[PDB]
Amino acid sequence: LEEAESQVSQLSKIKVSLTTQLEDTKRLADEEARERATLLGKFRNLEHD
Amino acid sequence: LEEAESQVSQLSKIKVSLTTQLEDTKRLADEEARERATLLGKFRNLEHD
């Protein structure tokens, strides 16, 4: 029971460390998806005229 | 200890889940950024003529 909570107490950082690391890369993918619509939007008209 | 062996398996499948997810979304973050450079590539190409 002591070795289990010592297995918990180091894992408890790992859960917190990854849920921040995910959203940092996720907001990178979120802002980039907000970017590529405008730039390709600036492409599809500019190839036309 | 029954709380432990329930929970020490519970978050353990969360980690082996999310260590794949940090591989996938970052690979998108390796992709959609370098696709943006190519879309920036033809755009700065198509201004030149």
Which short descriptors sum up this protein?
part of a larger assembly; 2 chains; 49 residues; mainly alpha
Q: How far apart, in Å, are the first and last alpha carbons of chain A?
A: 72 Å
* Number of helices in the DSSP assignment of chain A: 1
Strand content of chain A: under 5%
Any idea what the shape of chain A is?
A: rod-shaped
Structural class computed from helices and strand pairing of chain A: mainly alpha
Largest interface: A-B, 26 and 27 residues
Q: If you compute it from the alpha carbons, what radius of gyration of chain A comes out, rounded to the nearest whole angstrom?
A: 21 Å
Topology:
The structure is cut from a larger assembly and holds two copies of chain A (49 residues).
Chain A: H1 2-44
PDB class: motor protein
Keywords: striated muscle, asynchronous flight muscle, motor protein
Entry title: Lethocerus Myosin II complete coiled-coil domain resolved in its native environment
Task: Put the structure in a nutshell.
The structure is cut from a larger assembly and holds two copies of chain A (49 residues). Chain A is mostly helical.
What features would you describe in this structure?
The structure is cut from a larger assembly and holds two copies of chain A (49 residues). Chain A is an all-alpha fold and 49 residues long. The first copy, chain A, is 88% helix and 0% strand. Chain A has one helix and no strands. The first copy, chain A, has one helix at 2-44. The longest helix of chain A is centred in the middle third of the chain and has 43 residues, at 2-44. Chain A is rod-shaped, with a radius of gyration of 21 Å. The termini of chain A are far apart.
